[PDB]
Amino acid sequence: SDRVLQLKLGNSSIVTQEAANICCAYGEWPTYLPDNEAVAIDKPTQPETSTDRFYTLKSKKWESNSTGWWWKLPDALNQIGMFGQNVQYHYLYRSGFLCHVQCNATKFHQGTLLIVAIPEHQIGKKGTGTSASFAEVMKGAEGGVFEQPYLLDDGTSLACALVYPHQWINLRTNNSATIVLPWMNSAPMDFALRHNNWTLAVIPVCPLAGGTGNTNTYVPITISIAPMCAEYNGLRNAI
Amino acid sequence: SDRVLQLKLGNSSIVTQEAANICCAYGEWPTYLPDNEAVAIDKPTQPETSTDRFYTLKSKKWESNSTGWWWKLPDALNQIGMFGQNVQYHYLYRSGFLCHVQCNATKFHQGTLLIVAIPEHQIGKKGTGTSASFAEVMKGAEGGVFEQPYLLDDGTSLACALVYPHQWINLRTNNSATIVLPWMNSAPMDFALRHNNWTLAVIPVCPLAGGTGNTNTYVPITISIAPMCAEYNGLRNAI
Amino acid sequence: SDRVLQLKLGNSSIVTQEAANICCAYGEWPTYLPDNEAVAIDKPTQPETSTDRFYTLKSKKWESNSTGWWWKLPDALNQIGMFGQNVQYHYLYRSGFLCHVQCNATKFHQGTLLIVAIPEHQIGKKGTGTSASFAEVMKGAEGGVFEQPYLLDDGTSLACALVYPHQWINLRTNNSATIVLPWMNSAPMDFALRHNNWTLAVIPVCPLAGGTGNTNTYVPITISIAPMCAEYNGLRNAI
Amino acid sequence: GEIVKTVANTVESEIKAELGVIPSLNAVETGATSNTEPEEAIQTRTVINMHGTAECLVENFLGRSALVCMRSFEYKNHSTSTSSIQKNFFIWTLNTRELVQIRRKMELFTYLRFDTEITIVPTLRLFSSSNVSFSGLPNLTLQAMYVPTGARKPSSQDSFEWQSACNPSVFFKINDPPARLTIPFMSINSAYANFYDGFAGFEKKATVLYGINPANTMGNLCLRVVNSYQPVQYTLTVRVYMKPKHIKAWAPRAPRTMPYTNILNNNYAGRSAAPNAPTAIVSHRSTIKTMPNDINL
Amino acid sequence: GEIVKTVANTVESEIKAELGVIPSLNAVETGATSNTEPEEAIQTRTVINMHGTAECLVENFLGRSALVCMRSFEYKNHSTSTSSIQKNFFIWTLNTRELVQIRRKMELFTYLRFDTEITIVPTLRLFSSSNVSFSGLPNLTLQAMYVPTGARKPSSQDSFEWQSACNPSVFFKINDPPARLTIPFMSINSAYANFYDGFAGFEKKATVLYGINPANTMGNLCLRVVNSYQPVQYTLTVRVYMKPKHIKAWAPRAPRTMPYTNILNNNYAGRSAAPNAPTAIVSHRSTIKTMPNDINL
Amino acid sequence: QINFYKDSYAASASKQDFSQDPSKFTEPVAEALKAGAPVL
Amino acid sequence: QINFYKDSYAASASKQDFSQDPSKFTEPVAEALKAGAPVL
Amino acid sequence: ESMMEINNVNDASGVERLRVQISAQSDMDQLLFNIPLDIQLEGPLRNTLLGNISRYYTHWSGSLEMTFMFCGSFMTTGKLIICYTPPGGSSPTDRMQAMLATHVVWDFGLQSSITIIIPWISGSHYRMFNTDAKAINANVGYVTCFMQTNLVAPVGAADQCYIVGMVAAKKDFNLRLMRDSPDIGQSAILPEQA
Ligand SMILES: Cc1cc(CCCOc2c(C)cc(-c3noc(C(F)(F)F)n3)cc2C)on1
Ligand SMILES: Cc1cc(CCCOc2c(C)cc(-c3noc(C(F)(F)F)n3)cc2C)on1
Question: Burial level of C234, CB count in 10 A (0-12/13-18/19+)?
């Protein structure tokens, strides 16, 4: 064991050499729904390798004035691969997520990201009574941006976001963060299109900087999410 | 055993030949704070010989019209020796006190002193609502004088001061009084600079007198106080 | 075990990540004076946490032309904290010293310091018969500077200073040096005000340098000294 | 997982100068909180701590009775030229967001499963009219009727929906002790959710609001004065108190900082200046080196 | 330390003329009270005393319910041109010094550790106006809310600090039995202190008062009329009674002689002449040889 | 707990459960952190 | 004592403790005074 | 652990308030930043998990941990001294005075964070969350951070780095006497819309 990690799910394999650890959210690993907790009586489809694999989303440019980014699960993966098709074709879904955030910079660069898995992250809007529109909330694989990262866009605090399963990417120590998410719902399964269990948020707490010849460096942030123990019930036409 | 006593603490040794007894306040001897009663988690400094020794304060002239004198502990010893330095350098103190009042006169002289160890002696002022100032209350090694000794400067009574650990110096019987004080606080340790556990009071109940050639005799009253099982917590800069 | 070290004495805790080792002077650790070696018959005061803790002295700017610095123990700590007070209030002292020299620079900087614990370091002056004055010898926490570091200011050699307990701070390998000093005297105790057992010396053997953009860099040298198994005898007034 | 009836004891610690052991250094990047003990950061004494923890149990922290509803209607003859509607009642639409102390305290967790004890506290005042002589508050009978989701609501004091043949209802007077009952854990799911990152409808229309949970549709409380109208106008104020019992709590949240603005969402305006402003939660001090309450002698 | 359920028995004593034995002589200078028994001072008979001591236990001596607070506010519409503040409540700032009987009795010890039973007794009067016809006292709901140290206090009857989601509050009506509850031993220290020879602040300023204890900051009791204002003015008088339970007492004090003047300190003015004057506690008699109540035949 | 009513949910505040597992939130890491060890 | 409530501090007046040690206040002397003896 | 607003100044906005700008000094032994420990008063510890939840209680006892994460460059080095001064007098402004209290010397390296245990040092078993900060019942003392050596960064690396401070309670921590938190207020019943 060390600062090195290889994650292997189906076709996919990710390696990192500047890791910290694996964050198992609430010290739990995702598992398939047992019979004692089962509600939907139809036999579920458990596609292991075709769905439980790393889906890499589009990267984001870390800027000096970057407020931060969020991706809502499963919305981020609902129009991607066989996870998307099984979502489009089924009423109910259940899955955990292995999230892996990647950011490479030099030993001369400075900057820190908080990577937070927030359960049931209800976005609050500043300076209005009107609740957030479908467009603002459901952005899919492109994800959304933080307007008020200080308040977690919730009227809460970034300060107290460390209750939530989290890691840091401190360019001194770390180029990659890894958070294992189990199923988080009051119900055993849910409708993927109209509810998100998790929100993976990447907030720059300390800004990206360099010295004299390392300013304005192009530093992307890449997010790879692997569904874990994915189940689907209610086989119908595709929506 | 007899009317003779030698007190030996560290460097110090006091002898008396006209004693009465040793008054152990509430039949208790000072001891170090046990673990079952401990609050402050830092390892305490227990300087035995350098602090637990007799500090002799400045003497007071017993006059025909003397109202009486008081010394507040630990305030009296807070600017004296290594007890003072450990007080100045630490947040918390705990100690008992072996108090020894001395007064020499002839077999032809008459007079009686009550020596009272009063716990939490809150001074009441006559003819005002204004509470006693820092100056009036904190006089250190010089101590203070009784304005209303009849009322113990408390709106209480000198008469009923014998509840408190006490001895008498009756010049017929006694030239010295000795009171052993244990730790007296609702808390296990305290801040020496802003609270006094004890007040040693010397009140003339019967005045100093002589016959024809023993009037206006110079009779001082000397007080020697030995801290017992002194502890200090919260090592910081000196205040 | 590794290149990382945490030193914990009383209130104090120092951590370093670029260490070399701990130098135990003559392979010995400081211990309290035993009865078989005891001379002074009075019971000694052993204040553990209040004296046996890291006292950080004022830092020194490492210059390209820096000759080197020395601190004489216990003179350096005789007017600092409860170690100073116990010195001022007692005739005799005995203690070891855990010395910790600190110097941070970049991976691009070059420079080497010899950190020497010299016992009974009698300073020789160049070009005079007159012996060094009290002022020149007793500089306390501020310490002194080397005029002739080549000769250890002794008419000896820097070359042969490696007989003495020593470490190096080589900015390639090391940012901190640690030397454990035991009691070094022909007598079991001594008078702190008029004799120094040890002299901690910091001599630049290889000068501080950088390349094109790392010249004239502000690099201080910080010294933290912890008395170990401190004893005091001869409780008197403060000097 | 261990039992903690009293806080941890402190063990006596010695001097430690050991290579390869750095208990005071941690890696915050792992997501793990510092594991450094006082015993290994400073020199400690033996302390046997007998401080109890029962007051910090989630049963004790949430299981106090809190106000969840305050409604006031006028108790009088509401009849006019052509109304025939008495209107001596109110309907609430059950929720736990109208009052901020219970809301912020409940919103410290994502999921809660609890049975809830309810206490109703009624109060009367005579309405200050032009000609009004007070002489005492009538001992009126009140009816609190829980109307579950999809049941007919009352439109008047004199409605027959008040039958309550199967609707749970409680009858209680003014001069009696406040009405009390326990509602069970009554969610369609295994826990109540204080936040819903989603929608409660299958449609994608604006009318389908974000944050609304399809398990918070809990029906309505309908409370009436059973007594017919008095010759004078009274104002009945009803206070409903909620005490969670048998509580399980999951996924602790970041506490609310900005003041609440409504019960439908968690939106905010913030206060004009610190504290609890959108750009400044903690009040300002002069500098990072300034102690605002510095003790001066 | 021995058990004493009944007072000491008396043993029959004989004539005693023995050299070296002087039981009637004592040395008061030792600080020790005389140890002379009646058996050895006079010739006594055998007496089996069955007088009980349970009434002189500190549990019995202090464990009676005593008045600790009397506050009266006007229950009416306090609103004006521009106020919008109803002011139908009071705040006390908890203490045990306002009433002298419980104060002097508690002040007989330095330290007390007790759990305290509280009983609140409300009473109404109609305010004697120019035109006022009495016909009976409204059964008002009252709310006593304990606001602990550092909590927001209510500024009005209609304030939302009354939520009491976590603040302990009791609701009780006028025509009900007086409200009662037990507050535990709630000191930061192991006992309550009736006297503090020191200051409660780290500063040396005049504003830092002598005698104030940094463990007597016990918060406040806020009591309100829950009912909105009546058409007429009422005066609510609240009496709070304190009964110490499970009492431990230490370091008995000299009893108070001079009349109390305030609750912040133990200062005195004394009465003009004896008794309880600064220079004369006991009333005067003609001479040391005069019996004032001498039985004449 | 006591309960004078038929249903179990009608009972008073449940018997104090003093079980604590703060590791769920304080050390939720796959490989456990050893006390005193460099956790890299 | 009886107590109908969960907490022990809510209980009624505590069971009579008839223990007395007046020597704490009446003879608080290092060397005990013997009855009939000259106490000098 | 939860981040502290150490930079609670009227020039920092939002995420600027949760980081402390540490720079290379043209000086030695200088104070960098302070932390008030008045949880009840508007200070860096208020908006923490410790602060918000402890602020639902009146009495508290136990040791606190405060962890500082250095967020400069891998090539940037430095030694800091963070000191907890127990109460009694003024907050230290010289390193010679601060070093005499409970402290930890911080060497930057592979382990990016340091913990200082603020140990339970009080006469009373509990302290009170009181509005009077200068009260003996309430005051915890001071946390101060000084330069031990300096911050040294090579030309290629930024000279102005940042430190993030976190605070948590230890297993010896207790709270009593529950109360309504002053964090949240209400002037009216919250409407459906407005
Ligand atoms: C979110 C959320 C919602 C809840 C449950 C709240 C309980 O709601 C009530 C309330 C406040 C009162 C009554 C009620 N009051 O009186 C009556 C009765 F009269 F009908 F019995 N019912 C019933 C329910 C379900 O728990 N979490
Ligand atoms: C000195 C000293 C102080 C004390 C404790 C006195 C108890 O103080 C009270 C009182 C008198 C009443 C209430 C009280 N009355 O009603 C309520 C409730 F409604 F909030 F529950 N609390 C609470 C306390 C702490 O004991 N010794």
Answer: middle
Count of domains for chain H: 1
Strand partners, E222: E91, E145
Query: What distance in angstroms lies between residue E98's CA and the mean position of ligand 2's atoms?
Result: 14
Partner-chain residue, chosen from D8, D52, D60, that has the shortest CB–CB distance to H172: D8
Q: Does D295 contact B at CB distance below 8 Å?
A: no
Domain ranges of chain G: 1-40
The verdict on the CB of residue E96 being under 6 Å from ligand 2 is yes
Using CB distances shorter than 6 Å, the residues near ligand 1 are D 68, 94, 96, 116, 118, 144-146, 168-170, 181, 183, 192, 216, 218, 221, 240, 242
Question: Tokens standing for C187?
Answer: 């007598």
β-partners of residue D88 are: none
CB of C184 closer than 8 Å to CB of C120? yes
Mutation site, C2, C8, C15, C79, interface H, largest H CB count within 10 A: C15
Burial D61-80 (b: 16+ CB within 10 A, else e): bbbbbbbbbbbebebbbbee
CB atoms within 10 A of CB D173: 15
In angstroms, the CA H157 to CA A209 distance is 8
**Smallest CA separation from ligand 1 atom 5, residue:** D116
How would you class E258 by CB atoms within 10 Å of its CB: exposed for 0-12, middle for 13-18, buried for 19 or more?
Answer: buried
Q: How far is H30 from chain C (nearest CA, A)?
A: 10
Distance between CA atoms of residues E23 and E172, nearest Å: 63
Cβ of C40 under 8 Å from any chain B Cβ?
Answer: no
- Helix or strand run (H / E) with residue C222: strand C220-235
Resolution (A): 2.3
Q: Is B186 on the interface with E (CB under 8 A)?
A: yes
Given C48, C82, C232, which is nearest B43 (Cβ)? C48
Residue E56: what are its φ and ψ, rounded to 5°? -100, 5
Alpha helix segments (H runs only) across H45-136: 49-54, 95-98
Give dist(CA D71, CA D89) in Å, integer.
10
Task: State the best of A24, A154, A167 to mutate against chain D, taking most chain D CBs within 10 Å.
Answer: A154
Angle of helix C81-89 versus helix B81-89 axis, rounded to 10: 170
Q: Hey, is C228 helix, strand or coil?
A: strand
Q: How was this structure determined?
A: cryo-EM
Measured in degrees and rounded to the nearest 5, phi and psi for residue C60 equal: -125, 135
Which residue has 């310091």 as its token pair? C113
Beta strand pairing status for C90-102 and C220-235? Answer: antiparallel
Distance CA(D15)–CA(D12), nearest Å, equals: 11
Phi/psi for D195 (5° steps) reads -140, 140
C86/C194 Cα distance (integer angstroms):
15
Domains and CATH numbers, chain C: 5-235 (2.60.120.20)
Nearest chain C residue to B9, by CA: C43
Contacts of C150 (CB under 8 A, 6+ apart): C157, C158
Contact indicator for E230, D134 with CB cutoff of 8 Å: yes
Chain A contact for D100 (CB, 8 A cutoff): no
The partner residues of A24 in beta bridges, in order of sequence, read A180
* Residue B41 touches partner C, C-beta closer than 8 Å: no
Asked if A69 contacts A181 with a C-beta cutoff of 8 angstroms, the reply is: no
User: Could you please report the per-residue DSSP string of D252-293?
Assistant: EPPPP-SPP--SS---B---SSSSSBTTBSSPPBS-TT--TT
Is C224 within 8 Å of C13 (Cβ atoms)? no
3-state secondary structure H12-43: CCHHHHHCEEEECCCCCCCEEEEEECCCCCCC
Q: Do H28 and C56 touch (CB under 8 A)?
A: no
